Amino acid sequence: HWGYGKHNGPEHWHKDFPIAKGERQSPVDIDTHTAKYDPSLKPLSVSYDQATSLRILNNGHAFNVEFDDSQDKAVLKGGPLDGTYRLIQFHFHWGSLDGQGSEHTVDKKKYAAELHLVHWNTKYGDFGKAVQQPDGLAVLGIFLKVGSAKPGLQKVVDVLDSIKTKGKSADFTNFDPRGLLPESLDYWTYPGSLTTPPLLECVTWIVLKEPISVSSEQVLKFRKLNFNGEGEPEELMVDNWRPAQPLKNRQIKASFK
Ligand SMILES: NS(=O)(=O)c1c(F)c(F)c(S(=O)(=O)CCO)c(NCc2ccccc2)c1F
Ligand SMILES: [Zn+2]
Numbered sequence: 001h002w003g004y005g006k007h008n009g010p011e012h013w014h015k016d017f018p019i020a021k022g023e024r025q026s027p028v029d030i031d032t033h034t035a036k037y038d039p040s041l042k043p044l045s046v047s048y049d050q051a052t053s054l055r056i057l058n059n060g061h062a063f064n065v066e067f068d069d070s071q072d073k074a075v076l077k078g079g080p081l082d083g084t085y086r087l088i089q090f091h092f093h094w095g096s097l098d099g100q101g102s103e104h105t106v107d108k109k110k111y112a113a114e115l116h117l118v119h120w121n122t123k124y125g126d127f128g129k130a131v132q133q134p135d136g137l138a139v140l141g142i143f144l145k146v147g148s149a150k151p152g153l154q155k156v157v158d159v160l161d162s163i164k165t166k167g168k169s170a171d172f173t174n175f176d177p178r179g180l181l182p183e184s185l186d187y188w189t190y191p192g193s194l195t196t197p198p199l200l201e202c203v204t205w206i207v208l209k210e211p212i213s214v215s216s217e218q219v220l221k222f223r224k225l226n227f228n229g230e231g232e233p234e235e236l237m238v239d240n241w242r243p244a245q246p247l248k249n250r251q252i253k254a255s256f257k
Contacts, residue, residue, distance in 0.1 A: 001016065002016060002017075002196075002197050003060075003061070003227065004061075004227070004239055004240050004241075010242045010243060013197055013199065016197065017197045017198055017199045019193070019198070019199050019200065019201060020197075020199050022193065022199070022201055023201070023248050023249070024191050024192050024193060024201045024248065024250065025192065025193050025199065025201075025245040025246075025248075026103070026104075026192030026193045026194070026195050026203060026205060026242075026245065027102075027103035027104040027105075027192070027195055027205075027242060027243075027244055027245065028104065028190070028192065028244050028245060028246075028247050028250075028252070029104070029105045029106075029107075029108055029244045029247075030104055030105065030106050030107075030188050030207065030252055031107065031252070032106060032107055032254075033107075034252075035188055035252045035253065035254040036251055036252070036253050036254065037253075037254045037255075037256070037257055038253045038254065038255070041079065041080055041189070041253060041254075041255045042078045042079060042080075043078055043079070043185060043255075044076070044078055044079035044140075044185045044187055044206060044255075045075075045076065045077045045078035045079070046076055046140075046178075046181065046185070047074070047075050047076075047077070048074045048087070048176070048177050048178050049178075050073040050074065051067060051073055051074035051087065051175075051176065051177055051178075052067055052068040052073055052074075052173075053065055053066065053067055053172050053173055053174065053175040053177075054066045054067060054068055054171075054172065054173065055169055055170065055171060055172050056156070056159055056163060056169065056170050056172040057163065057168070057169040057170075058163040058164065058165060058166055058167065058168045058169070058225060058226075058237075059166070059167075060166035060167070060227055060228075060229075061196060061227070061240055062091040062092060062093065062237070062240055063091060063092075063160070063163060063225065064089045064090070064091045065089060065090050065091070065156065065172060065175060065177075066088070066089045066172075067087050067088060067089060069086040069087060069088045069120070069127070072084065072086060072122070073086070073087075074086065074087035074177065075087065075119070076117075076119045076138050076140060076206075079138075079187065079189065079206055079255070080189045080204060080206065080253065081138055081204060081206075082135075083121045083122060083123055083135070084121070084122045085119035085120060085121050085122065085137070085138040086119055086120055086122055087117060087118070087119050087177070088118050088119065088120055088127050089118050090115060090116060090117040090118060090177060090180075091115075091116055091118075092113050092114065092115050092116070092144070092222065093113060093114045093116070093195075093240055093241040093242075094112060094113035094114075094144075094219060094222050094223070094238065094239075094240070094241070095110075095112060095113065095238060095239055095241065096223065096236075096238040096239050098112045098146045098216070098219070099112070100112075100239070100241070101113040101114065101144075101239070101241055102114040102143055102144075102241065103141075103195050103241045103242055103243075103244075104141055104143075104205075104207050104244070105244055106143075106209075111143040111144060111145055111211060112144050112145060112146050112214075112219055113143075113144035113214070113219060113222065114141055114142070114143055114144065114241070115141070115142040115143075115144065115180060115212075116139050116140070116141055116195075117139065117140040117142075117177065117180075118137065118139050119137065119138045119139070119140070120136060120137055120138075121133070121135060121136055121137070121138070124136055130202065131194070131198075131200045131202045132200070132202070133202055134191075134201065134202060135202075135204065136202040136203075137194075137202050137203045137204065138203070138204045138206060139203050139204075139205055139206070140206050140208070141205060141206065141207040141208065142180065142181070142182065142207075142208050142211070142212055143207075143208070143211035143212070144211060144212055144213070144214045144219070145211045145212075145213050145214075146213070146214060146215065146216050146219055147213035147214075147215070148213045148215065149213075149214065149215035149217075149218060150179070150180065150212050150213060150214045150215075150218065151179070152176070152178070152179015152180055153179065153180060153214055153218055154218070155175055156175070157218050157221045157222070159172060160221050160222070160224065160225060161221075161224070163225075164224070164225060164226055164230075165226045165228060165229050165230040165232075166226065166227065166228055166229040166230075166232075167229055167230075168230070180212065181212070182208060182210040182211065182212050183210065184208070184209065184210045185208065186208065186209045186210065186254075186255055186256035187206045187207060187208050187209065187254075187255050187256075188205075188206075188207045188209065188252050188253065188254050188255075189204065189205060189206050189207070189252070189253050189254075189255070190205055190250055190251070190252045190253065191203070191204060191205070191250065192205045192250075195241075195242045196242070209256065222237075223236055223237070223238050224236070225237035227240075
């Protein structure tokens, strides 16, 4: 039932998923002036050299690039984390217009899109068990602005027309997610949730301060996808973002400045 519309969008979610009005929901606005610098936060360690992508999938809400997470191949550690967290999939959130699309905001500024690289804590042995734990996921969030093309993104954009509608999927091997990272790993970090149902409160969010630039033609290709399945009426996959939620009793920490 849930989705992104007038009748089943974010403002409706709490009827099926009451944790939508919980104590540590995401995303949030990052108020850069009131983020606390923590000189004890460590550099983020992103070890993606052995990554193995498998498939790309239109799930009706976004597209996911899935990875083999059956060994320690692509891992996030360090930063604010105590564990080792395995990459399972990345996906994006984007807008109908370049002026919106991100889930997190920075001093109320929306970006055109937001990449989420989803990782699960290896102490829990698999993703489905990890989402049931308060320290089960680490999601690395990267803002996209429209400008110059991101060449490392183009392999993703070029396959989208094969997964146009809900439930479609395609082989997607040898994709290197290092091509999607900005130069700096400076980040903000806070405890939150999945930003789609089931909205579980299992995520340590790590949001990079520096956005990547993508071209207008790259983001236009994301907006040609469909939320509907093949042979159902066309509804463009745009505006699949959840807006900022109340910060409540949380402090956002900065690794920098
Ligand atoms: N946008 S998010 O990064 O905060 C997010 C969600 F909001 C979310 F609900 C999910 S969920 O659908 O998997 C939770 C269901 O137990 C994932 N996880 C991505 C994923 C999806 C399918 C298979 C593997 C990973 C997820 F990454
Ligand atoms: Zn997401």
